[PDB]
Each structure stands twice: as C-alpha cells, then as structure tokens.
C-alpha cells in the first residue's frame, strides 16, 4: 500500500458510521517510521512516513481511508503504573526520579497524574517515596508521552 | 575532633550571640558521611556520621557546640541556572528532561522555580525547550535537593 502520511484521526469523526480495520501497535512500537504491517483484517500495508509525529502514532491515527472503509492505528493495552501526586513538589520528585531511570513517562488527565510502564523497580521506587499509585491494564498513547530531547544515550 | 551526629541547626538559635566557625563546602561535597575538614579558623574536624541526613548537610547544620563556640556548615555559592516553569505540566517536563541528563536539581523559593548547577548542555536543553531561565551566583542548599533513589539500572 505504502502510506507516506496520515489521513487524520478517529477522534475527528463518528467511528460507528464507518467500518474500521486496525493495525495493532504496541506502545513501544509507535515511533516506527518505516515498516510493513498486516492489518487486523489481514491486509498488507506499507509505511514510509515522510513527517511522522515526533512522539509516535497515536490511538486513532488513520493510515488509510477509502469511502466508508478505514484503517486506523490501535494501541494495545499494557500493564501500567498510574501515579497520583498530591503536590507540585511531588510531581517534580516523581518525574525527576523516573527520568533518572530512562523509563517512559506519560501525562494523565490531571497534571498531578501520570502513567508509566509497569516495572518492579519503578513500583518499588514509588512505594519508597510514599507516592499513591496503582497497577492496571491501560493504554499509553503516544500524544501523551513526555519528551527526551537531549538524553545521554 | 571527630563528629558523629549533628547538634541542631543555626536557624534554631541566634547566631549573633555565638562565635561561629564554618566548614565551607561546595554543593557537591555535602553528602559526605565520613570526611576530614579544616574550619575557616584552621581547626581540624573529622566527621563520621552514624546517621547522616539523607539530603546531605545543609546551611547552618551544627557540627559542634560548647559554651559560646559553634562549628557550622556553610555551603558556598556557585553558578546556578534558575528555572521558572509556567505550569505543573511544564514542571513535569523540565524535571523529567533534567532527570534524563542526571543533572542535580533543587527546589527554589516558588513552587515553579528550580535550580540546577550551571552546565552548558543543560542551558542548551532549556533553551531548546523554551523554558525561562537565568544564570546567577546562588546557593544550592542540601535540604532543597531533589534526590535519586535506591539502585537504578541503566541498560
Ligand atoms: Zn543515564
């Protein structure tokens, strides 16, 4: 197929009025800029993305749309620690710490909330900081990722 | 003289009523638990702290007090980038970025101000992120530090 740019995103429309086939990406695969995918319905579709979003493909991103037929990115659920801060200071401590670990971090709905992939040591760290948290199955959406602009590799 | 635990801190009494002699430390020396120092007046003072404060020694921490004589810690000024965030989201962004560089990071007076030692790569990153900052000669006091915990593996 060879898609070089997105068509838009399912958020723009009422999805039920369309028939939608998915490419299932794992949260860690969304920065893929050139790759072959077979869809959920078995269609082979190529990606040579000229200007990919810096952060990755997000839930809903439409790779192909013809008439009522859509092919959209879907992001698979993964085990996640949801973090709930109670102060600006604790927001800073968490983000600094998780930063020092090079672990992925995602904005939640509240600027005191975050999500990060479940790892026993991130869990242990949070417990040591006495930060309210819980483990659950959830979606890490590329548009909510915190950036790393000058990482030491 | 070998010091095993802090007596209090100068904030709790009136230093103007005492002879205070200081041990001068740079911000990056404040986490020593076992160390040898010379005070400003030339006195030798060794520390072996059974139970060091987790954040490091802070401005005014008292090593020794007897009669009207005190030996206290002084943290020297150093060149600091003061950062001024605009929102909690931006505080998260800054701390995570600085975290990934392993730069030291400290709270400022306001809950949206942070301080980080001056380093040119750190300055470039803040300019890249469009963050407000300026470079001042200023104190990084241990009790305001943000720290890094147990063991962290860096593939
Ligand atoms: Zn590192």
Strand pairing class (B78-84; A69-75): unpaired
Rounded distance between C-alpha atoms, residue B14 and residue B72, angstroms: 13
Q: What is the CATH architecture assignment of A76-153?
A: 2-Layer Sandwich (3.30)
Using the Cβ of B154 and the Cβ atoms of chain A, whether some distance falls under 8 Å is answered with yes
Rounded distance between C-alpha atoms, residue A43 and residue A57, angstroms: 19
Q: What is the domain partition of chain B in residue ranges?
A: 1-75, 76-155
- Distance of CA A81 from the midpoint of ligand 1 (Å): 21
Helix (H, G, I), strand (E, B) or coil at A117: strand
Among candidates B128, B121, B114, which has minimal Cα distance to B81? Answer: B114
DSSP readout, B105-149? EEE-SSTTEEEEE--HHHHHHHHHTT-EEEEEEE---GGGEE---
Whether residues A100 and B99 touch (CB distance < 8 A) is answered with yes
Using the Cβ of B105 and the Cβ atoms of chain A, whether some distance falls under 8 Å is answered with yes
**What are the helix (H) ranges across chain A?**
88-100, 120-129
Residue labelled with tokens 């890094």: B148
Beta bridge partners of residue B72, listed in sequence order: B22, B62
Shortest Cα distance from A95 to chain B (angstroms)? 5
Residue A149 tokens, joined: 């602009």
Rounded distance between C-alpha atoms, residue B104 and residue B139, angstroms: 13
Beta bridge partners of residue B137, listed in sequence order: B79
Whether residues B112 and A150 touch (CB distance < 8 A) is answered with no
Contact (Cβ atoms closer than 8 angstroms) between residue A50 and residue A33 = no
Q: How many residues does this entry show for chain B?
A: 155
Residue B66 tokens, joined: 């007897």
Contact (Cβ atoms closer than 8 angstroms) between residue A80 and residue A23 = no
Per DSSP, B61 falls in state B
Rounded distance between C-alpha atoms, residue A147 and residue A48, angstroms: 23
User: What CATH number has the domain spanning B76-155?
Assistant: 3.30.70.790
Among candidates A25, A17, A21, which has minimal Cα distance to A49? Answer: A25
Among candidates A56, A40, A38, A31, which has minimal Cα distance to A1? Answer: A38
Rounded distance between C-alpha atoms, residue A86 and residue A144, angstroms: 20
Contact (Cβ atoms closer than 8 angstroms) between residue A97 and residue B99 = yes
Beta bridge partners of residue B71, listed in sequence order: B21, B64
Chain B residues near residue A147 by CB distance under 8 angstroms = 93, 97
Sorted by sequence, the CB contacts under 8 Å of residue A18 that are 6+ apart come out as A65, A68, A69, A70
- Distance of CA B119 from the midpoint of ligand 1 (Å): 17
Helix (H, G, I), strand (E, B) or coil at B20: strand
Contact (Cβ atoms closer than 8 angstroms) between residue B99 and residue A96 = yes
E strand or H helix that includes residue A74: strand A69-75
Experimentally determined by:
X-ray
Helix (H, G, I), strand (E, B) or coil at B33: coil
Contact (Cβ atoms closer than 8 angstroms) between residue B15 and residue B70 = yes
Sorted by sequence, the CB contacts under 8 Å of residue A22 that are 6+ apart come out as A39, A40, A71, A72, A73, A74
Contact (Cβ atoms closer than 8 angstroms) between residue A28 and residue A80 = no
Sorted by sequence, the CB contacts under 8 Å of residue A151 that are 6+ apart come out as A102, B100, B101
Beta bridge partners of residue A93, listed in sequence order: none
Whether residues A146 and B96 touch (CB distance < 8 A) is answered with yes
Residue A58 tokens, joined: 């997000």
**How many CB atoms neighbour CB B153 within 10 A?**
7
Rounded distance between C-alpha atoms, residue B33 and residue B36, angstroms: 10
Helix (H, G, I), strand (E, B) or coil at A6: coil
Residue B77: CA count within 13 A, CB half-sphere:
5
Helix (H, G, I), strand (E, B) or coil at A100: helix
Residue labelled with tokens 């007046």: B41
Helix (H, G, I), strand (E, B) or coil at A89: helix
**If 0-12 CB within 10 Å is exposed, 13-18 middle and 19+ buried, where does residue A32 land?**
middle
Superfamily covering domain A1-75? Urease metallochaperone UreE, N-terminal domain (2.60.260.20)
Among candidates B14, B6, B12, B11, which has minimal Cα distance to B23? Answer: B6
Residue labelled with tokens 């300026």: B134
Per DSSP, A92 falls in state H
Sorted by sequence, the CB contacts under 8 Å of residue B52 that are 6+ apart come out as B31, B33
Q: What is the resolution of this structure in A?
A: 2.5
Rounded distance between C-alpha atoms, residue B63 and residue B71, angstroms: 5
**How many CB atoms neighbour CB B140 within 10 A?**
23
Contact (Cβ atoms closer than 8 angstroms) between residue B81 and residue B97 = no
Chain B residues near residue A152 by CB distance under 8 angstroms = 100-102
Residue A28 tokens, joined: 């860690």
Contact (Cβ atoms closer than 8 angstroms) between residue A144 and residue A56 = no
C-alpha to C-alpha distances, B145 to A123, B97, B117, nearest whole angstrom: 22, 16, 11
Strand pairing class (B44-48; B2-3): parallel
């Amino acid at each position: 197929m060879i898609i070089e740019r997105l068509v838009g995103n399912l958020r723009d429309l009422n999805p039920l009025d369309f028939s939608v086939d998915y490419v299932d990406l794992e949260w860690f695969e969304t920065r893929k800029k050139i790759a072959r995918f077979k869809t959920r319905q078995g269609k082979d579709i190529a990606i040579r993305l000229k200007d990919a979003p810096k952060l990755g493909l997000s839930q809903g991103d439409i790779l192909f749309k013809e008439e009522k037929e859509i092919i959209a990115v879907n992001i698979l659920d993964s085990e996640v620690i949801h973090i709930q801060a109670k102060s600006v200071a604790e927001v800073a401590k968490i983000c600094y710490e998780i930063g020092n670990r090079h672990a992925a971090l995602y904005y939640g709905e509240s600027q005191f909330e975050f999500k990060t992939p479940f790892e026993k040591p991130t869990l242990a760290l949070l417990e040591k900081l006495g930060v309210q948290n819980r483990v659950l199955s959830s979606k890490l959406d590329s548009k909510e990722r915190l950036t790393v602009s000058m990482p030491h590799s």
